[PDB]
Design a protein around this ligand. Structure first.
Ligand SMILES: */C(=C/C(=O)Nc1ccc2ncnc(Nc3cccc(Br)c3)c2c1)CN(C)C
Length: 251
């Protein structure tokens, strides 16, 4: 047992979040620390990754039943946030800033030579001040509406198939959380994307952002941009790219 190990007695499971691998609880730790607990690796893994825009591992419990203890994200998962009461007031500047934070977390993952494998809004967690962090490395190495064609078809998961999933996350953000390829079923999406079909410009989303999306969805993995490119572009967006941005009904 390594130094990430803790006694169960040091954890107070409190509220469910959190369904249903098992539950997800809000909690306390050594009486003093507000945490999140994943009941039954992602932890392992989350032991070797440390970044400000990745939800931080705190502790593990070997130890059936296995707990994973993590930084608590106060606003819950991004999909829910986007589609609930806040969705309505989020506008393009805030949505692009959130995208930049996810890019920043993913840039780190890229620097470390890892792959996420399940990058989408359901796996981004929000905290205070609209902070967004990459979560759920359950499949991190070492669902197909978000999965690049080469990866869904031939199991070639790479940082480049993550970029693809990032393009799809950009459509979730600009549409307030709508399921991608509206009206199409998994098999329809598979067939059409293989023919060269790509989602159109979301309504009110600028062409330059959709442009970025379309780059992320290049047929050719090695032609998709870096996450560090993505990060810098999204960070600098409202000066270098859309300096004449004016607010609209929805974006
Ligand atoms: C939407 C619900 C959701 O993700 N809720 C949620 C709220 C707050 C929170 N804080 C910390 N950690 C988690 N999740 C978590 C993920 C992986 C490991 C551990 Br430990 C905790 C969390 C989750 C999800 N729908 C699928 C959109």
């Amino acid at each position: 047992k390594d130094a990430w190990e803790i006694p169960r007695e040091s954890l107070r499971l409190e509220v469910k979040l959190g369904q249903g691998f098992g539950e997800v609880w809000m909690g306390t730790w050594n009486g003093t620390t507000r945490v999140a607990i994943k009941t039954l690796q992602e932890a392992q893994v989350m032991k070797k990754l440390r970044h400000e825009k990745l939800v931080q591992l705190y502790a593990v419990v070997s130890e059936e039943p296995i707990y994973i203890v993590m930084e608590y994200m106060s606003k819950g998962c991004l999909l829910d946030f986007l589609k609930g009461e806040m969705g309505k007031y989020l506008r393009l500047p805030q949505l692009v800033d959130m995208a930049a934070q996810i890019a920043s977390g993913m840039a780190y993952v890229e620097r470390m030579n890892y792959v996420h494998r399940d990058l989408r809004a359901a796996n981004i967690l929000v905290g205070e001040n609209l902070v967004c962090k990459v979560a759920d490395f359950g499949l991190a190495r070492l669902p197909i509406k978000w999965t690049a064609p080469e990866a869904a078809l031939y199991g070639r998961f790479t940082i480049k198939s993550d970029v693809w999933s990032f393009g799809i996350l950009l459509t979730e953000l600009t549409t307030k959380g709508r399921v991608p390829y509206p009206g199409m079923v998994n098999r329809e999406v598979l067939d059409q994307v293989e023919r060269g079909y790509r989602m159109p410009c979301p309504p009110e989303c600028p062409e330059s952002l959709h442009d970025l999306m379309c780059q992320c969805w290049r047929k050719d993995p090695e032609e998709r941009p870096t996450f560090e490119y993505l990060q810098a572009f999204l960070e600098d967006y409202f000066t270098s790219t859309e300096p004449q941005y004016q607010p609209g009904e929805n974006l």
